Design a protein around this ligand. Structure first.
Ligand SMILES: C[Se]CC[C@H](N)C(=O)N[C@H](C(=O)Nc1ccc(C)cc1)C1CCCCC1
Ligand SMILES: C[Se]CC[C@H](N)C(=O)N[C@H](C(=O)Nc1ccc(C)cc1)C1CCCCC1
Ligand SMILES: [Zn+2]
Ligand SMILES: [Zn+2]
Lengths: 955, 959
């Protein structure tokens, strides 16, 4: 009651938003946002502490992150560490947390009926945490797992490297994650009791005055107010001043510097950075957004367009980048072609020529107005967010914007401040640059090493003569400001729900050329539509060469349409175009208004587009590198890849694709395109703000454009062949072994093939998967410490299914095999032993997950598209399958496990892929395992086995 | 010495390569004999040819000679049983058949070499004391009616009889030789005619020893064979019947300068040009008709065909002499017609006369005669060993026309060049003596006559005198030239010594990404020949219907372009075959090894550097369209077999999908297809014959190098070498696919009981069951029940899978044939339970002998090896291994197998039936009881059927 310092005024929201909001500040300094949503299926809450890794002690790197893991381990009210995670698990809930440089964000979701119980357990960690000593070692191992994961990742390596080259005394040089060495090895050597320093950091930093709470529930604003005051007013206020970092981590000696970096993957990238003051305070005018929009533009006359025309770069990212409170960066990042790598100096001069063109032309009010207008449309028609992510996001935002501006924060622009644009543009000068080149061409030509990741690099000062050349850049006529964006939507009319509107997609067209599935949106009522097209051709995957040609065609087509499509993308109209094992896939999403205009341009271009020889050669080289770069992918990813090659009727390997790539000539590709488009079948899903007639009109326009320009004729029904899954023999065990040449970790996929999909088979497998899910994580990951990646669940491909296990470990694959088999026995035991009440809780947990309602149109369309791409067309699956699930007995699951999964099962169909670590050589009692049949040749393996039938559709 | 022998002939001229021994003699009763002693023979044979046929038929019974042929072999005084001869042959791995022509009735059998005396004794009784069992009368009439009814839907039998009906009706050549129900039952009953008494009248008047010729082939010596033939044939009654002669041509002045316009069954366009000629038989040592047929029928450069093709009128031509009877013959020039050719019949004929006049102007050529004589000498010397049954039948006929000493050289050796005789024959090839027939559907409803024996519709017109005058005054055409020296005539007949490392079966001598090469140097026949088989694999040959059409057109255009050049090689005993498959292309080169690499090189070069002539492309495309439509006029059982292959194979394009995609085949599309097809290949080859390992490797390298150079061929990935799988039928399932034949008023059916994947055991279970049921299936379904003209049973093998099949063509509905087959299977289940171990072991022994039967020519050996290669099983020693397993089999093992896989109540019964309805069809009696049959699942959509079933694995290779 007097526990409230102030209640905010109206929380500005979209007129389309039916959720109710209340902003307030508690007497202890906690900033609060309450969200009342009577329709919500899940309730949520988040707390964001404005303290992170930048506040870590110099002697303990990763302490803030360690505290994040340690904070949620029992309280005075709820002593058991498992209490919070167990309560959420029992009430269809989840939780997670993240530590950044200036924040530690904690969040959960729970069933709408259990918000008070979940929130009470959550609030206790900010009142009386116990920090349970029992879990210390495991958490250190969980922080060490997260770091060891990122070590071989090129992006994280680059992230730490930038921190290592600036002012060494600056908190920005800190290693924020931590690992075993920083949280255990070094403090033990140095005589640091980690527990007392953790407790000390918590006492010094965890103050209510630096905390922000967001709560979303079914309950009214008043009921939510009372509950938050009840649970959060007791949080201790220590009046901790908010840490600021006003000195830029890059001083005069850190400027006009050049870095030459060796990557893990075969990538060529150029990173251009300028230190800038913190622009956060200027958010109402956002001059960095204005400059990022122009420098990062991809339309005609853009910086990117000229760099592409010159054959130096393929992609560009430009704009402002966060630092911390007090410092920021302005970046211009490009990828490089082979020629671009030899013209780094010319690329930079071109970047400065474009910057100087912005100075010469001066700020543009019309550009600012367009950005403001698009942001207003984006805010008004924003998709409804999933509660968990929505509370977490707002909890962070509460620290930067007044209560009333919490939702409009990242959207609304108000005043045009040309002076501020000019101020920022004055910093984008050669005397203020930092340049980094990432290339394998630097291997063995570097003298320095970054300590955290092992990144090899060289530092050089940029010559004064190079700086002078950049300063004296002659004006380039190729650079022009963008023109008026003609894709800005204006028609937001929501068409009335038709008399014959359906709850699921209906087949409205069934011809030799096309199958058309349509549903007018009856849930979201936003002026948007999703238009999905699957184009089928036997010539898209007939051999590796054709598969390569299908890929290059679509990449060149997207490259050619880029300048035009970018304006549409800025205006909330996006598309995706990709090749498949059956043909092509096209998706058009966003505002329905200019949607037929973009679709028409894509179909026309598909059928009559010009191939630029220079682009062809550049895209072909990039595709070759992309294929090789798969060697640097994670061992578990490799395991999953080999199993797909093994189990599918036709599948071309990365090696067969790269070998056939050299035979792709420009004349061969020019003949391929009319061949591919000559005969097609189109299957579509048109879902959103559209009528039945408008849907038919869109499909007809796609057909007519292809018929006109490509002389498209339909395929015969006998030509519409889908690939089958390999039928494994009863009691058989096959193993396929390979080695990852990059990572020193093992990868494994174990697949227990069951049978063809059916209502019963799906539910037996899904309920077994539900039951084993939590124990698999608790046993294999938590207890046994097998590895970071421990996964179990149903595997579905080509109408067939089974149980799979995916594990990435430092331990050999043969050992992971015995541990999984050991676990299956423990699970057989666990089902025999479990109470009917515990069993019925598994049925209910599964039923809730299956009936989980899409919060946005794309999530609904994706569910319908899944039914279409599998040719099962079971749109009412969730209801029918849940109804069957509820009839299932504990005995039914025991019977199923005994026939299909048990080590001694008569119908056990086991296939394992073993991916060895780089250096690798070629507890519950584990059962006796048979000798596996080692697969030497994938072709002979497939030839020697039958192929399953394909699933009968739902008519 | 022996009084029963009138005379013994001198040396029977044979090839120096022929190890068989021959003896010619004439018996005292007038029987001309040839005895063949072959100690090597697996089967013994004998034939008797009576120099009396259909031309001697009485006007009261048309088909009486033919009816006698069927009635003679039904009971004897020594062997009273009606089926005694048939049973004896069936029990001793034998067979028999007979034919009646205009001037001959030829009877023949084959039997296991150990049972010649027993088979021959039963055979000889029919010429000593025949009975003609009154009980088999109606069943023989129905057999003759079946034969004719079958010929009724055949366009060639229609033409043959229409030719007989447009000559002098008073001439015996106009007679209907076959007979039918009407001439054998309907008519004699209405007229009070005694068919049996007229049958005996004819036999007693014509069947005389003085008009008979006997040939006997066996392992026995010439002396043992002499005694046996004298013993069995000297008692044949001599009635001194004079040999009928027909010296007046059935084509008299009023039958000349006549034009016929005929309606065919299939959509075919043909032109037939006929000239009456005197009987040239007596001139066999010079054979002027052969000389003239060789030039008029020539396909090389400057030929009549070449010009007719260039003009776009015809695709193919047949020219030469045609048999008539003793006293008359015909000279023919037959062509097929394009759409334009049909409108230029008058111009085609003028061109035929221009070529004929060019032969008159140039006069006979001694060098042409010498080439024909030289090729015939090579052909006679290196001839493959003939099957005994066909060899005895042929000689029995030949004995009536040539002296005993010339019976083998008869149809081979030319001696004297008689330019006067060539000139004499060429004088008859004139417009005033011409008969012209046009066959086209364009005449449908525009005809006024009907040939009553066949129902053929036609129109007759006299050719205008003005048209005859134009043909007589034909201006000389320079496009017509005589052929040049045939450079393909083989000269090198060296048999290369058998290499130290020569193998009994083909060995893999090359295993690369581009080619698998199987090689075997011949170690059996020692003739200067070799068979070169190439299978070219490409995923682009059958990817879709359009590509399948393009693969077909490419190869047809390629054979058309290479025709002029290949014809000279074909004349010189060097032939080739080039055809598209569901996996790519198939090329086979056979004959004399000498100029073999030269022809192969030209084919590969042409394949890779092919320039398509637009005019040919359009002509060949139209002919392919008609060929696809023409399948509707194919027999109902052929349709049934076709639908089952479509149903059971993973990928298969229908005739309808092929014809629909044909209109999209443009010239630029075909020109892009060829480099695409040849860009990536895998070659699998079998080179077998008179060749060494090095020569084999040199041939393969030359094929590879030619493709690599001209087509830039690269190998296919091993994962791209995919073979099609067979559909895996569910346990206890029965599927039926039903269609209708719009042309024939007969039903067609194929029943397939799918068993399992091929293996040593599975193959032998199925093969032994097939062995046991074979003869009973024919005797029950065909002979007793009278189901149809076509009754077949045996193992069905496709894509590594197998089963039992039944193929039947009947006038009865397919669901009735179904019940009868199922009743038969029960009778067979019974028969195996009942049979003695001795009878069972006789089945094992009969199968083992058939499986171990040695190939008798190189092509038969290569075909066996090629079967192992095309199936990718490579089990060249299969026969020995499989026979060894077969001998271990028990009667119980077969009962178990039948009970699990084939029985109506079997737990693993996989039945699939194709039912092809007749044109006008709509869908106790002391007979075997048909079981209760389930309701079949009717296949409506072939695609849905395949999608809903699993696919079998592919068979693991031996090598
Ligand atoms: C997803 Se890639 C699109 C590449 C496009 N060429 C580009 O540069 N776009 C700008 C952009 O995302 N820049 C950005 C984002 C994050 C950071 C850390 C820094 C810069 C925007 C232009 C519209 C106004 C806002 C920015
Ligand atoms: C088999 Se298709 C080859 C068609 C070739 N264009 C051609 O006419 N060749 C002549 C031929 O078969 N004519 C023939 C055969 C049978 C009868 C009843 C009538 C004529 C022969 C040429 C060598 C000398 C002997 C004949
Ligand atoms: Zn963490
Ligand atoms: Zn007959």
């Amino acid at each position: 009651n007097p526990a409230i310092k102030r209640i905010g005024n109206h929380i500005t929201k979209s007129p389309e938003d039916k959720r109710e909001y209340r902003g307030l500040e508690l007497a202890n300094g906690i900033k609060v946002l309450l969200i009342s949503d009577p329709t919500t299926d899940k309730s949520s809450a988040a707390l964001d502490v404005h303290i992170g890794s930048l506040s870590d002690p110099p002697n303990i790197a990763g302490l803030s992150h360690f505290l994040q893991h340690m904070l949620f381990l029992g309280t005075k009210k709820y002593p058991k560490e498992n209490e919070y995670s167990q309560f959420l698990s029992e009430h269809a809930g989840s939780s997670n947390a993240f530590t950044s440089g200036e924040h530690t964000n904690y969040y959960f979701d729970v069933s709408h009926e259990h918000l008070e119980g979940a929130l009470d357990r959550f609030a206790q960690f900010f009142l009386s945490p116990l920090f349970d000593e029992s879990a210390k070692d495991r958490e250190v191992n969980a922080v060490d797992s997260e770091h060891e994961k990122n070590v071989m990742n090129d992006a994280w390596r680059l992230f730490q490297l930038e921190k290592a080259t600036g002012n060494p005394k600056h908190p920005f040089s800190k290693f924020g994650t931590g690992n075993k060495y920083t949280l255990e090895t070094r403090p033990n050597q140095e005589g640091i009791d980690v527990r007392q320093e953790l407790l000390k950091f918590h006492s010094a930093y965890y103050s209510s005055n630096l905390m922000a709470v967001v709560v979303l529930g079914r309950e009214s604003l008043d009921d939510l107010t009372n509950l938050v005051v009840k649970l959060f007013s007791e949080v201790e206020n220590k009046n901790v001043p908010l840490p600021e970092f006003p000195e830029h981590p890059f001083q005069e000696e850190h400027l006009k510097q050049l870095y030459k970096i060796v990557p893990i993957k075969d990538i060529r990238n150029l990173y251009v950075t300028f230190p800038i003051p913190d622009l956060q305070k200027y958010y109402k005018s956002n001059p960095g957004h204005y400059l990022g929009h122009l420098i990062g533009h991809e339309g005609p006359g853009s910086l990117l367009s000229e760099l592409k025309s010159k054959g130096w770069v393929n992609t560009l990212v430009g704009g402002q980048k966060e630092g911390a409170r007090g410092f920021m960066f302005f970046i211009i990042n490009v990828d490089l072609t082979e020629e671009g790598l030899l013209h780094v100096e010319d690329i930079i001069l071109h970047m400065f020529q474009y910057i100087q063109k912005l100075r010469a032309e001066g700020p543009q009010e019309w550009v600012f107005q367009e950005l403001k207008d698009l942001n207003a449309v984006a805010f008004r028609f924003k998709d409804k967010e999933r509660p968990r992510g929505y509370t977490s996001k707002i909890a962070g935002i509460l620290h930067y914007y007044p209560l009333e501006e919490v939702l409009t924060a990242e959207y609304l622009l108000e005043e045009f401040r040309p002076d501020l644009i000019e101020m920022v543009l004055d910093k984008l000068r050669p005397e203020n640059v930092r340049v980094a080149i990432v290339s394998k061409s630097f291997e063995g030509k570097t003298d320095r090493t970054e300590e955290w990741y092992g990144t090899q690099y060289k530092q050089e000062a940029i010559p004064d003569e190079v700086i002078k050349k950049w300063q004296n850049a002659d004006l380039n006529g190729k650079f022009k400001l963008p023109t008026k964006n003609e894709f800005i939507p204006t028609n937001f009319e929501i068409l009335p729900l038709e008399k014959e509107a359906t709850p699921y997609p209906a087949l409205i067209k069934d011809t030799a050329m096309s199958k058309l599935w349509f549903k007018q949106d009856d849930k979201f009522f936003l002026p948007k539509a999703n238009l999905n097209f699957e184009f089928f051709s036997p010539f898209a995957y007939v051999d590796p060469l054709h598969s390569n040609m299908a890929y290059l065609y679509l990449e060149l087509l997207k490259d050619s349409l880029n300048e035009y499509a970018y304006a549409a993308e800025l205006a909330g109209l996006s598309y995706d175009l990709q090749n498949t094992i059956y043909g092509m896939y096209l998706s058009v999403k966003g505002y329905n208004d200019k949607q037929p205009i973009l679709l028409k341009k894509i179909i026309e271009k598909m059928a009559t587009f010009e191939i630029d020889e220079k682009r062809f050669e550049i895209i072909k080289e990039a595709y070759m590198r992309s294929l090789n770069n798969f060697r640097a992918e994670q061992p578990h990813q490799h395991a999953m890849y080999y199993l797909r090659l093994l189990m599918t009727e036709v599948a071309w390997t990365k090696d067969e694709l790269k070998e056939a790539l050299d035979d792709v000539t420009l004349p061969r590709l020019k003949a391929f395109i009319p061949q591919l488009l000559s005969r097609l079948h189109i299957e579509a899903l048109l879902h959103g703000n559209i009528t039945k007639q408008a849907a038919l009109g869109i499909m007809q326009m796609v057909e007519d454009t292809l018929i006109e320009h490509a002389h498209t004729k339909p395929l015969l029904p006998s030509q519409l062949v889908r690939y089958r899954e390999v039928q494994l023999p009863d009691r058989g065990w096959f193993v396929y072994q390979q080695r990852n040449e990059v990572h020193n970790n093992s990868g494994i996929e174990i697949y227990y093939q069951t049978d063809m999909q059916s209502t019963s088979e799906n539910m037996f497998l899904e309920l077994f998967a539900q039951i084993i899910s939590e124990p698999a994580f608790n046993t294999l990951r938590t207890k046994e410490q097998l590895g970071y990646i421990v996964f179990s669940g149903p595997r579905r491909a080509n109408g067939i299914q089974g149980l799979r296990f995916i594990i990435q470990s430092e331990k050999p694959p043969h050992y992971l095999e015995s541990r999984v088999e050991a676990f299956l026995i423990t699970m057989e035991k666990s089902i025999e032993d479990m109470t009917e009440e515990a069993f019925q809780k598994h049925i209910q947990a599964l039923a809730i997950r299956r009936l989980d309602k899409p919060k946005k149109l794309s999530a609904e369309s994706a569910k319908y598209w899944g039914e279409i791409i599998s040719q099962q067309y079971n749109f009412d699956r969730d209801n029918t399958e849940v109804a069957y699930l509820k009839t299932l007995t504990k005995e039914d699951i025991i019977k199923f496990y005994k026939e299909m999964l048990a080590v001694d099962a008569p119908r056990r169909h086991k296939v394992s892929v073993h991916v060895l670590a780089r250096e690798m050589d070629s507890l519950s009692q584990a059962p006796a395992l048979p000798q596996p049949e080692v697969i030497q040749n994938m072709t002979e393996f497939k030839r020697g086995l039958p192929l399953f039938p394909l699933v009968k559709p739902h008519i």
